Design a protein around this ligand. Structure first.
Ligand SMILES: Nc1nc2c(ncn2[C@@H]2O[C@H](COP(=O)(O)OP(=O)(O)O)[C@@H](O)[C@H]2O)c(=O)[nH]1
Length: 305
């Protein structure tokens, strides 16, 4: 049974990890990382690492990624001790500030160099945060690409396509927390659900390793043609920056409220295989979530770009 750990890096990442904890992701261990001592005290993770004590004197990184980077490097041993034993590590962070932008790539490289399957799940800032955050965030994503095995980037501006028009700013960040939770949960569910192995870990690791940027989409449908419709939605999800056309590796999970037939799963898989336009190493699993009625959920991770 794989040891999964989820690490928040910086304020946005730790706020997302707090939402993961509240909501009850089970069978994973949570860690929070920050340069800002006071922000770090409000985090709900049982393992907390204040990085760059000497450098920052605990006062944060002031939106400077070079400071977040040197803080994580200063604290490398402590981060490694907190990671030791993980088979898989998620690094979650909002790109664009100092700590997550700078430290999250150091943290990822540390995990990867312990042999863990290292998955980044990160956001690009909303446009209201300004062109400067957006620029810093883009350098952050480029550094994260090299540091992880697989990177999932979610643009926060795309969240606005799937929330009510009346959504205030505070709720839009709560939505950002929820999407990071869903991306982490959805990838976690490829490994194990309800404490039971789903896809073979070694084969997941093979597909997700040393890939850099990858693509993740989740789609939902019901009634007639539900499997195919859910699959089409997954691969055209509003959160996707690219299409899956070309992908050399695909991991797929299909979730229903009763054990799904292989036939039906395979119809959804055929949509994803076709849309690829090239011949994939594709692996899929099926899971049961009792709370579902007639809805099927299709989760797709595509890599090899
Ligand atoms: N998910 C989430 N993202 C946030 C929140 N607050 C800010 N962000 C995003 O995270 C980015 C980095 O800010 P922050 O995490 O505060 O900076 P850092 O602590 O220096 O990395 C921001 O540009 C926002 O896009 C939040 O509460 N939740």
């Amino acid at each position: 049974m794989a040891t999964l750990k989820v690490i928040g890096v910086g304020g946005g990442g730790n706020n997302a990890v707090n939402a993961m904890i509240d909501h009850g992701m089970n069978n994973v261990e949570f860690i929070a990382i920050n340069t800002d001592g006071q922000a770090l005290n409000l985090s709900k993770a049982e393992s907390k690492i204040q990085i760059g004590e000497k450098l920052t004197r605990g006062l944060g990184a002031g939106a400077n990624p070079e400071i977040g980077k040197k803080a994580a490097e200063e604290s490398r041993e402590q981060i490694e001790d907190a990671i030791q034993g993980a088979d898989m590590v998620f690094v979650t962070s909002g790109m664009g500030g100092g700590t997550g932008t700078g430290a999250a790539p150091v943290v990822a490289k540390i995990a990867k160099e312990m042999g863990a399957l290292t998955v980044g799940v990160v956001t690009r800032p909303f446009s209201f945060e300004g062109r400067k955050r957006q620029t810093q965030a883009a350098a952050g994503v480029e550094a994260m690409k090299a540091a992880v095995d697989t990177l999932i980037v979610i643009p926060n501006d795309r969240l606005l396509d799937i929330v009510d028009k009346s959504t205030p700013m505070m709720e839009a960040f709560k939505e950002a927390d929820n999407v990071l939770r869903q991306g982490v949960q959805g990838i976690s569910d490829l490994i194990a659900v309800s404490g039971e192995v789903n896809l073979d870990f070694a084969d997941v690791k093979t597909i997700m390793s040393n890939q850099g940027s990858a693509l993740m989409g989740i789609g939902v449908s019901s009634g007639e043609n539900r499997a195919v419709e859910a699959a089409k939605k997954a691969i055209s999800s509003p959160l996707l920056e690219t299409s899956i056309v070309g992908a050399q590796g695909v991991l797929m999970n299909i979730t229903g409220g009763e054990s799904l037939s292989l036939f039906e799963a395979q119809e959804a898989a055929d949509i994803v295989q076709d849309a690829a336009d090239e011949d994939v190493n594709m692996i899929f699993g099926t899971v049961i979530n009792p709370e579902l009625q007639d809805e099927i959920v299709v989760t797709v991770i595509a890599t090899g770009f």
